[PDB]
Curated annotation (Swiss-Prot):
Changing residue 132 to A: Strong reduction in catalytic activity. This is Undecaprenyl-diphosphooligosaccharide--protein glycotransferase. [alpha-D-GalNAc-(1->4)]2-[beta-D-Glc-(1->3)]-[alpha-D-GalNAc-(1->4)]2-alpha-D-GalNAc-(1->3)-alpha-D-diNAcBac-tri-trans,hepta-cis-undecaprenyl diphosphate binds at residue 27. Belongs to the STT3 family. The record marks 132 as: Interacts with target acceptor peptide in protein substrate. Disulfide bonds: none annotated. Residues 22-24 are annotated as: Interacts with target acceptor peptide in protein substrate. It comes from the Bacteria. Glycans are attached at residue 95. Oligosaccharyltransferase that catalyzes the transfer of a preassembled heptasaccharide from a lipid donor to an asparagine residue in nascent polypeptide chains, affording a beta-linked glycan to the asparagine side chain of target proteins. Oligosaccharyl transferase (OST) that catalyzes the initial transfer of a defined glycan (GalNAc(2)GlcGalNAc(3)Bac(NAc)(2) in eubacteria, where Bac(NAc)(2) is di-N-acetyl bacillosamine) from the lipid carrier undecaprenol-pyrophosphate to an asparagine residue within an Asp/Glu-Asn-X-Ser/Thr consensus motif in nascent polypeptide chains, the first step in protein N-glycosylation. Changing residue 131 to A: No effect on catalytic activity. The chain holds residues 436 to 713 of 713 of the full protein.
């Protein structure tokens, strides 16, 4: 129950703290937790979405840093450039002229956070977001496609599975065609239990792109499988929520649930 988990968040965290998350949950979080957010029903323009999306789509370390940067610079952006165009502001304070290289800059373990820490930050990552994560991650691109297609079985006739995304998957989980021809999946990944670290990956051809996810116990209707590329596989969302793999020098797990996870930025 979301209200319960976000009411748990209220007590754990502080009124000044931010929760970083997608805007669809902006209001619920502010209501249940009584904390600040980056976006919400009333504030989710492209320029807005970029920051939650980045710290949800990029690699853990990159997301850890943006979380801190975006929060600190948005807060400050309430006292010139810092108003309207917060990414430029932070680039100057890092003397980076090229948007793409600064952003790539963030993935490095050797990135200095000059700006002081002024408040706590939490990541909120609900299961149900998978169904929309494709749209979430799209906003971490300045506007080179990605792939995050979730699907449920329509039928299972023969040794194949008629996935809802027009895809036809083999029962050994090693190929699909989409009504055409075979293309080996990079690896196989099945989630026996999220709350628990119950999963396993089977390497099956390196030069292959798409990963395949089997959600043996999806409590989410319409999300039984996930087909994703190497990038989405890298995201903090997949790695941290689904695979429950995270750096304990970057994040603290303060709320574990079947339905959602909450991490405390430690930086
Ligand atoms: Ca403070």
């Amino acid at each position: 129950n979301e209200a319960s988990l976000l009411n748990q968040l209220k007590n754990i965290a502080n009124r000044e703290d931010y929760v970083v998350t997608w805007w669809d949950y902006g209001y619920p979080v502010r209501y249940y937790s009584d904390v600040k957010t980056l976006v919400d029903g009333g504030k989710h323009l492209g320029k807005d979405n970029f920051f939650p999306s980045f710290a949800l789509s990029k690699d853990e370390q990159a997301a850890a840093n943006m979380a801190r940067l975006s929060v600190e610079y948005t807060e400050k952006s309430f006292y010139d450039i810092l108003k309207s165009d917060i990414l430029q502001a932070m680039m100057k304070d890092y003397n980076q002229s090229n948007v793409d290289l600064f952003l790539a800059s963030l993935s490095k373990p050797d990135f200095k956070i000059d700006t002081p820490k002024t408040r706590d930050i939490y990541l909120y990552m609900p299961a149900r977001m998978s169904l929309i994560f494709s749209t979430v991650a799209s906003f971490s691109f300045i506007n080179k496609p990605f792939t995050f297609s979730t699907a449920y079985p329509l039928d299972v006739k023969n040794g194949e599975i008629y996935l809802s995304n027009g895809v036809v998957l083999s029962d050994d989980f090693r190929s699909f065609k989409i009504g055409d021809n075979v293309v080996s999946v990079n690896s196989i990944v099945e989630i026996n239990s999220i709350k628990q670290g119950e999963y396993k990956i089977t390497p099956i051809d390196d030069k292959a792109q798409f990963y395949i996810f089997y959600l043996k116990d999806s409590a989410i209707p319409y999300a039984q499988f996930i087909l994703m590329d190497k990038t989405m596989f890298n995201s903090a969302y997949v790695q941290m929520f689904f695979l429950g793999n995270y750096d304990k020098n970057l994040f603290d797990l303060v709320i574990n649930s079947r339905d959602a996870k909450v991490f405390k930025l430690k930086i």
